[PDB]
Structures are given as C-alpha cells and as structure tokens.
Paper text:
The [name] ([name]) is the prototype and founding member of the immunoglobulin (Ig) superfamily cell adhesion molecules (CAMs). [name] is present on the cell surface of neurons, astrocytes and oligodendrocytes, where it mediates homophilic and heterophilic cell adhesion. [name] is involved in neuronal migration, axon growth and guidance, as well as in synaptic plasticity associated with learning and memory. We conclude that the [name]–FGFR1 interaction at the cell surface may be transient or stabilised by avidity effects resulting from receptor clustering and that conformational changes within [name] may have a profound role in FGFR1 activation.
Our structure is of the shortest isoform (linker sequence TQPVREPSAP), whereas the underlined arginine residue is replaced by QG, HSPPPQG or even longer sequences in other variants. We do not think that the dimer observed in our crystals is physiologically relevant, as dimer interface residues are only poorly conserved and [name] dimers were never observed in electron microscopy studies. In agreement with our earlier prediction, the FRM and FGL loops are indeed located in close proximity on the same face of the wild-type [name] molecule. Intriguingly, the corresponding loop regions are in close proximity in the acutely bent conformation observed in crystals of the wild-type protein, suggesting that they are part of a larger FGFR1 binding site extending over the domain junction. The neuroglian tandem, which has an extensive domain interface that incorporates a bound sodium ion, adopts a conformation that is intermediate between the two conformations we report for the [name] tandem. Thus, a similar bend in the [name] linker(s) may be a general feature of other animal CAMs containing [name] domains in their membrane-proximal region.
Author numbering:
A (entry chain B): 497 to 691
B (entry chain A): 496 to 692
The structure:
Amino acid sequence: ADTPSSPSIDQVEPYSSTAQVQFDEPEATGGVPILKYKAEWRAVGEEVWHSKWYDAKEASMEGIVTIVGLKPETTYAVRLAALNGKGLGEISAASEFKTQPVREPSAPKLEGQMGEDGNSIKVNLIKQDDGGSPIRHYLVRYRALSSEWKPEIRLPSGSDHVMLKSLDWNAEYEVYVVAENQQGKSKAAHFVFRT
Amino acid sequence: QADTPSSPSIDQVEPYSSTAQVQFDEPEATGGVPILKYKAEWRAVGEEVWHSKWYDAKEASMEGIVTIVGLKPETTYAVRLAALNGKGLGEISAASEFKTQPVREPSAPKLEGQMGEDGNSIKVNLIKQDDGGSPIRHYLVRYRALSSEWKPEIRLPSGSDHVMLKSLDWNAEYEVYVVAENQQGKSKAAHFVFRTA
C-alpha cells in the first residue's frame, strides 16, 4: 500500500477569475482508494502556491474541479496531487493557462430551499465567476409551466437569494436567473421545481 | 401596423439517439410585437408527414435551443422553425438535415425537486430525458450533506420516477447526483444542490 502516482491534466478551460480543470486519475491508486484531490496554482512568476482540496467522488461525477480567485488576462500554472489512505501522492507536472479578459459574468448557481410556505421557495444564489468586474444585479424570470411568465424581478448584487411567493400548490415551475455586470449579461441559469 | 415575424435561422443541430437540440437565431424582424412561440417541424427521410411542436419563446431564447423529441435512432431528419407573434405565424426557416445517433447510454436525467414541508426532506422527481434508445433500467442516486461523508448509493427499481430524501440534517446544504443507466451503460451524472431549513 503506497500513495498514488501523479494524476495528469488533460485540458484547462479558464474564464475571467476561475478555471475548470479536466484531469485523469493516477495510473496507480497505490492500493487504497483516492479520497481527495489537491490543486495548487499561482500566477507565473509568483513563489507562493495557492491550494484547494476537492472531494474525489465529486470530481469524478462532475468531471472537473474548479479553481477560483484568479485575475483576468493573467497566466497561471496549475498542478494536482491525489490523497489516499496512505497520504498525498506525487504531484503532476504543471500546466499553464491564461484567464480570459474582463467580460460578462458566468451563469450563477441556484440552490433551492423551502420558503415561508408550501406554495413558496427560496432560491439561494451560489455566486460564480463575475467576469472580472462587479455584478450589478440579477435578473429573474419565472412562471408555472401551465401559465404565462411573471414580470421580471431585479435583485441587487448584494442579494444572496430570491424569494418566489404566492405560488400554485403542487404545481411545476421553472426559473431563470441572469447575472449582469458592466460588460454584459451572462447565460441564464435555469432551475425547475415542484411547489 | 405590425406584421408576422421573419424566419428564424438554424445555426446547428446536436442530436442524440431519440432527441435533438436545435440551435437557432431569433428572427431578424419581430414584426412589431413580441414573438410568443416557435413552431418546430421535422420529417424523417422518406416519411411524408411532418411532426410538429410548439415551444415557448422566452424559454427558448434563454437557452438558445428547442429540443425535439420522439426521434428514432440512426435516422436522418429534416427540421425547420417558424415564429408566432400577435399577427400570426411568420416565414418558415429553411429545412436543416441531421442524423440521430445510434442507440447508446442515456443522457443525464432532468431533476425536479419538491421541497418538503417538514423542512428537512425533499422529493426529487426524475423528469424524462433522452434514454439513448433503450429503456432506463436503473437510476442511481448519490447524495451527501456538503459537511459530511457520502451516504451509500441508492439504486432505484426500474419504473420509479422519483427518490425521497428524508430525516435530513437541519440548516445544511446537500448535493445530489443522479445517473441514468440502461443496457449500454451509465449516463453522465445530473445533479443539483438544495438546503434544508
């Protein structure tokens, strides 16, 4: 039983302040299952590594790990390692990538939560890459699948959620949320649920 | 003083086994009043009757695509779109040819959660997505509270269309991954996060 060999980076898909890393697991687990992945990254030139741990089962199902806290139009070096019952294995070779220039924000992530009533719902906003400049506000569109769209809801950048009230009981609804900054509007995140 | 819309234009078609994603641009001229719906029409090579389906405009606009369903695997089709507004249906787009993929693993399932009134439970309805051209035999469900270890995989019996998560931790965030599996294999995982009260 030994620590895993090094995983290898397939490709990196960077945005403005974050990057998506696709990788292949180590060819030798070492005897015991891979528990976590550790990513190290820093701007080319810097001498201090930034790091983040990622759950292995999650990385396998998602198919990637996302690095955050980067700056626009900047060249970065990233590397990975795997942790098993024995410890951290060999670090991979570093892969270099350049983040996108300042642009429209990425789609935000939506997380449902029980609202004030059964015919209600709290849609939490899991903030995503803002594109390099502060998001100015969130645009929200929603409707019951059976009827017409409700007027658009505008939320300030500070908002951590959006509340949809007075909904029909046990009916299906769909929600779209757009994050907009100075550069433009992001793609729409869509969320479907049943009250 | 308004007029029906001009014709939409199909950029490209990304097909699967029994469905296809149609990427298109909205009509250049709306005509004067907001486009309300899009009408998609498709006909398999050889067949003579055009199948059709209405799609909500706003919905389609936000995703950039309309999804045609009920197609046969390994089959060549022709598809076209038209827009409807206050004045009526506009010009039909040119027809676009595409061929569905052969039978394979299912595409990631669609997840529709129904928050539990008890504040610590949830019903995840499995909305029908492309099955790859072969019936889904089992839905595999992996879930955990972001603060904890994964719970054992829950394999649902063929036929089931939902999974119920109860007795959940309070004030906790949960991630759920659902895999559709048929004769040819497992789909990539569909997922979503939710929070207990």
